[PDB]
Design a protein around this ligand. Structure first.
Ligand SMILES: [Zn+2]
Ligand SMILES: [Zn+2]
Ligand SMILES: [Zn+2]
Lengths: 48, 111, 144, 48, 66, 97, 236, 429
RNA sequence: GUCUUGGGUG
């Protein structure tokens, strides 16, 4: 897999990214009012 | 079963002898008009079974793909017969079988 | 088209999850899954008329214009680099000039190396094409 | 697949015979649905 | 192509054993016994010699170009 | 597994054989290994899955594009209403709560 | 047996781009004159002598999709055509397709038909050699030798009547044994070896052909896979 | 004798691969092409003819003057290379690969120009055909492993490809439905037509498509009251009833039409489904009127009189109607019998007495390898060339001079066409 | 520096 990276070129767009799009702010989704990121693969098996 | 003309070799269509009230058959080409045997003039079917036993030949025993059963032949008590299901191909048809003996070539069934 | 590696199946350190996979650096150092790469560039001279043609030649700055931003210091006097020379990206490997139609009367049509690739020139071929004009093939080599 | 869900009246909704009678009332049958085979006979005299 | 000098997995020197291995195979010894006599005991070292395909013989058949 | 040949699934079966093995039941496990017939039937099923994955994604992407274009101009306003770009009301309170 | 069941591109070419099986072969095409001559000699009646009032049992004979006549008795005609093809008199890549429910006999000499070789099980029900392969250890001895005892290769096997070619249409009419052991019912109980299928419905099998080896259904790319029958097919 | 083991099977399989290899289909297809196909395409249309009888401002003196050339044998030589000096020598695939050349053989066609005048020529080079490596015309066929090594060729290289401008090209086999087979298809709900028997026709010589002819069953289940069957002849716009074409082919009495259709008079459902056809085509009773009825629809120019409208329709019924049956006159009975067979297959599918034909069945498909593909392309390009020869003999002959035909053939047409198709993949002009 | 064709990747 490959993913794209976009760099904001001003302070207004930096602030928008960090205060609206940041990963911690997206943990709960409005699609099914539940989390979208969970413990996965080896940490799940290992914690069990 | 409609016939054909003894003179013009076309097909005869129904007509009425109004002076005798007897169903003739009129040639649309010639003037010939013969007496008929059957006063039926039309038919229509929805529950049909044509194609039940018709799917058999003399050398159907020579087909090496037909599965062979141990059913007793009603005719000659033969312990070896090839079998197959109804050759009619409709959706609601049975799954009942037909049985062909390899000795007398008489077809039979398990009923 | 492969090699028999020694494979363990383990959740060793967590760097092999979701179809990742941990590989031995020492085995890499000893030649595991090591491969050669060969890239060949091609170029020839065209005939735009009667006496108007291109030429393989090292382009001097005075008589040429629109020279590429790469270095030309690797070409021999025939406009061709010699096998055995290390080449980096943007370096010229085939020098060519296109005459200016009616001093300083030539444009360049030089072939650089691909901007991504390093390597060492392997085999500089020289022949003539279907129409008898000069033809050059340059094969680069590298190791991945 | 068009489809209705026909809720029955409660007195019918518990009894099965009544529900089957309502089924018979609601279902569509045409003369096609109960006809086997039609002929045409020449019958010159109505009284014979 | 040509026999690797070291074993990939552990680093034992196997590049000096290909000719002895071929001579042992000539006189009838089966592959496991020949690998035993060359004192290749770890299956990594053994598969180094047992799975080698010697392509330099095929490359040498094309005439020297100088 | 349909009767792709005349009255059979494969030419190693006899005609009109409705048994589980004839019409695509795989009795073995992956550990035990599939027979050639079972291998071919499982290949047919996997091919169906691959075709579905390859072919349905275009219909799904089209559907999501159309939904996005239909609902793209709808915003919650400071008075609580849910309106489109024409200012028309879609819901008097968002989600009704 | 004709195209690899596993090798196909992902995406928009899935299932449209196919890859030949290892033993697949494409017909070159062949003249239809000897076919017509053999049919005319052995008893085929023409369509200028056709009268469906009488010919209620006759089998119609197609050659390359062209109806050329009718026969009173397809059994000996198919037997003689198959013997001629297995003797070399007819091109080995010529389809000989009898249809029994439809009362038809179709011979194809078209170019471009895909075909595959099979062993020929002796199916004539008159000799102790019935129900067994005609290929024996003498044939393998000759193949290893490289010559007959008064070049012996594949084509000599094909022309000696121990291997023949079948395209998809002829395959409809044949009964193929999966392995040479399947030709005889065994009397086992190995919790490790995979259960070879019961096959209990049919009282007596009349095999006509045997696969040379079932792994030959795969193509070039699928043949590299080790134990592909222990994998789910998308991974293959 | 002992039981054949698995190892015996692998010995047989090793024999198979020792004989045939892995690319034998490409090589054998191309060898067949170069041995027979080129000559057969040249003899497909083997003669050109110019003509002028009279009235060119002369003294009423009239002479019939035919200029004519007959194409003869094809001569196939080994691939050669021509330098800008004009020197020539043998060309090998490695040299063609290094200098971006095309690895092709010269094709010569003998031409013998004839003229006839009634009062009332060497091995012309027609183009270069690319050669499939490791085939019977490649220069790497006669060599042993030693010489192969000296020619810079890998012994593992199996051939099967072409070299165009120094680039290796492989022809992908093309899959197509078989030819000269009747297939019967179900149809869709908002369609008056329910059952369609479709056959494509082709000839044993050339293996090229000629014409297509569907036979549809109008009338849906319980809708479309007329359950007639109507043919679709090529080169006519509107669909003709079936009894019309049976009458046009020379069997007028409806009993004989049915008998060509009905093998078993006792059967009644099919005969009950055949009446609306007889009624919708009851008007005609002879061949001329039906055949005009066909002619009135032939999509030709407007207003042809009856006597030659008949000739046009008779020509359509003779050629472009089942060419695989025969394209010569006096054999209409076989076409009528095939029409009866096709109608019966239609009715069997329509009366549910047989299942509809399987489109995906691999026995009803053909694979077109290098041979037939190059045959199609070469036929196109050589008809181009012969049209050029005609266009040239129109002009040069006016000069009233002897001409040597080596300036009459522009050899670059076939060469450029083959090279363009094999280098781009676009199969056509 | 442009357009088509083909082979692919997630
Ligand atoms: Zn009459
Ligand atoms: Zn009996
Ligand atoms: Zn080691």
């Amino acid at each position: 897999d490959e993913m794209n990276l976009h760099v904001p070129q001003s302070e207004e767009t930096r602030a928008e990214l960090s205060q609206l799009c940041a990963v911690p702010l997206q943990i709960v989704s409005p699609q099914s009012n539940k989390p979208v990121m969970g413990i996965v693969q080896d940490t799940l098996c290992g914690v069990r | 079963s409609f016939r054909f003309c003894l003179e013009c070799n076309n097909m005869l269509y129904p007509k009425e002898d109004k002076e005798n009230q007897r169903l003739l058959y009129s040639c649309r080409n010639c003037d010939y008009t013969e007496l008929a045997e059957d006063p039926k003039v039309y038919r229509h079917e929805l529950i049909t079974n044509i194609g039940e036993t018709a799917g058999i030949v003399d050398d159907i025993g020579q087909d090496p793909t037909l599965p062979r059963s141990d059913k007793e032949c009603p005719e000659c008590h033969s312990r070896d017969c090839v079998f197959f299901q109804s050759q009619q191909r409709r959706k609601d048809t049975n799954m009942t079988l037909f049985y062909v003996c390899l000795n007398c070539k008489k077809t039979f069934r398990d009923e | 088209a492969g090699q028999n590696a020694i494979v363990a199946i383990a959740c060793y350190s967590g760097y092999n999850q979701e179809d990742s996979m941990i590989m031995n650096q020492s085995s890499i150092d000893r030649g595991l899954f090591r491969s050669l790469f060969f890239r060949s560039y091609m170029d020839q001279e065209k005939r735009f008329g009667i006496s108007i043609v291109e030429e393989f030649e090292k382009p001097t700055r005075a008589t040429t214009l629109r020279l590429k931003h790469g270095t030309y210091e690797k070409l021999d006097e025939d406009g061709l680099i010699a096998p055995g020379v290390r080449v980096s990206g943007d370096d010229i490997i085939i020098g060519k000039t296109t005459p200016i139609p009616p001093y300083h009367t030539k444009r360049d049509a030089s072939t650089p190396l691909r901007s991504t690739e390093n390597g060492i020139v392997d085999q500089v071929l020289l022949t003539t094409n279907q129409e008898g004009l000069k033809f050059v093939k340059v094969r680069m080599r590298t190791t991945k | 697949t068009p489809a209705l869900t026909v809720y029955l009246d409660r007195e019918i909704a518990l009894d099965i015979e009544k529900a089957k009678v309502i089924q018979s009332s609601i279902e569509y049958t045409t003369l096609k649905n109960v006809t086997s085979a039609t002929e045409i006979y020449y019958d010159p005299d109505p009284t014979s | 192509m040509i026999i690797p000098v070291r074993c990939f997995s552990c680093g034992k020197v196997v590049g000096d054993k290909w000719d002895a291995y071929l001579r042992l195979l000539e006189e009838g010894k089966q592959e496991g016994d020949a690998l035993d006599e060359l004192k290749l005991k770890r299956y990594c070292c053994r598969r180094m010699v047992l799975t080698h395909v010697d392509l330099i013989e095929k490359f040498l058949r094309y005439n020297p170009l100088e | 597994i349909a009767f792709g040949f005349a009255d059979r699934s494969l030419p190693h079966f006899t005609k009109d054989d409705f048994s589980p093995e004839s019409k695509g039941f795989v009795e073995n496990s992956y550990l035990r290994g599939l027979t050639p017939q079972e291998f071919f039937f499982h290949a047919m099923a996997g091919r169906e899955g691959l075709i579905d994955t390859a072919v349905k994604t275009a219909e799904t992407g089209y559907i999501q594009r159309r939904l996005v274009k239909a609902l793209e101009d709808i915003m919650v306003h400071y008075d609580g209403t849910t309106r489109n770009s024409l200012g028309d009301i879609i819901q008097f309170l968002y989600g009704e709560d | 047996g004709l195209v690899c069941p596993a090798e196909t591109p992902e995406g928009q070419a899935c299932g449209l781009v196919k890859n030949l099986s290892l033993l697949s072969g494409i017909s070159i095409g062949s003249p239809s004159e000897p076919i017509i001559n053999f049919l005319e000699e052995w008893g085929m009646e023409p369509l200028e002598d056709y009268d469906p009032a009488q010919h209620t049992k006759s089998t119609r004979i197609f050659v390359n999709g062209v109806w050329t006549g009718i026969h009173r008795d397809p059994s000996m005609l198919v037997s003689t055509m198959r013997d001629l093809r297995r003797s070399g008199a007819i091109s080995p890549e010529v389809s000989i397709i009898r249809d029994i429910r439809e009362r038809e006999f179709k011979i194809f000499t078209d170019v471009g038909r895909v075909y595959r070789p099979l062993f020929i099980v002796e199916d004539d029900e008159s000799k102790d050699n019935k129900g067994e392969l005609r290929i024996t250890k003498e044939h393998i001895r000759k193949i290893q030798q490289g010559y007959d005892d008064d070049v012996y290769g594949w084509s000599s096997l094909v022309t000696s009547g121990v291997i023949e070619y079948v395209d998809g249409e002829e395959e409809e009419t044949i009964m193929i044994a999966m392995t040479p052991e399947d030709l005889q019912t065994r009397s086992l109980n190995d919790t490790a070896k995979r259960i070879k299928p019961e096959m209990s419905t049919s009282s007596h099998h009349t095999f006509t052909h045997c696969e040379i080896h079932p792994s030959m259904i795969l193509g070039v790319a699928a043949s590299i896979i080790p134990f592909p029958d222990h994998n789910q097919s998308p991974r293959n | 004798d002992d039981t054949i083991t698995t190892e015996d099977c692998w010995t047989v399989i090793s024999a198979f691969f020792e004989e045939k290899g892995l690319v034998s289909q490409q090589l054998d297809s191309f060898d067949e092409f170069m041995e027979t196909s080129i000559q057969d395409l040249v003899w497909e249309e083997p003669r050109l003819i110019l003509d002028q009888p009279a009235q060119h401002t002369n003294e009423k003196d009239n002479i019939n003057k035919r200029y004519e050339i007959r194409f003869g044998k094809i001569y196939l030589s080994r691939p050669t290379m021509t330098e800008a000096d004009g020197t020539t020598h043998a060309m090998f695939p490695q040299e063609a690969r290094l200098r971006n050349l095309t690895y092709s053989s010269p094709v010569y066609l003998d031409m013998e120009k004839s003229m006839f005048t009634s009062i009332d020529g060497n091995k012309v080079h027609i183009g270069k055909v690319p050669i499939m490596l490791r085939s019977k015309f490649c220069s790497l066929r006669t060599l042993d492993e030693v010489d192969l090594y000296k020619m810079k060729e890998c012994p593992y290289d199996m051939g099967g490809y072409f070299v165009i401008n120094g680039s290796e090209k492989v022809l992908i086999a093309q899959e197509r439905s078989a030819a000269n087979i009747v297939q019967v298809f179900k149809k869709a709900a908002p369609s008056p037509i329910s059952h369609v028997a479709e056959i494509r026709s082709a000839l044993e010589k050339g293996s090229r498509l000629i014409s297509t002819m569907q036979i549809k069953l109008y009338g849906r289940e319980d809708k479309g009251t007329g359950r007639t069957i109507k043919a679709t002849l090529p080169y006519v716009k509107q669909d003709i009833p079936i009894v019309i074409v049976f009458r046009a082919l020379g069997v007028v009495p409806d009993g004989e039409i049915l008998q060509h259709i009905c093998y078993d008079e006792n059967d009644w459902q099919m005969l009950e489904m055949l009446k609306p056809c007889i009624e919708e085509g009851f008007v005609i009773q002879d061949k001329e009127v039906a055949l005009d009825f066909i002619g009135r629809r032939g999509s030709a120019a407007l207003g042809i009189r009856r006597e030659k409208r008949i000739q046009y329709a008779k020509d359509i019924l003779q050629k472009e109607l089942l060419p695989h049956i025969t394209q010569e006159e006096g054999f209409e009975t076989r076409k009528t019998f095939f029409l009866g067979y096709m109608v019966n297959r239609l009715l069997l599918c329509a009366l549910e007495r047989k299942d509809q034909d399987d489109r995906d069945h691999f026995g009803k498909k053909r694979l077109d390898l290098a041979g037939p593909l190059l045959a199609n392309l070469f036929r196109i390009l050589f008809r181009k060339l012969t049209r050029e020869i005609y266009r040239y003999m129109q002009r040069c002959i006016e000069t009233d001079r002897d001409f040597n035909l080596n300036l009459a053939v522009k050899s670059t047409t076939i060469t450029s066409g083959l090279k363009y198709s094999l280098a781009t993949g676009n199969w056509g002009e």
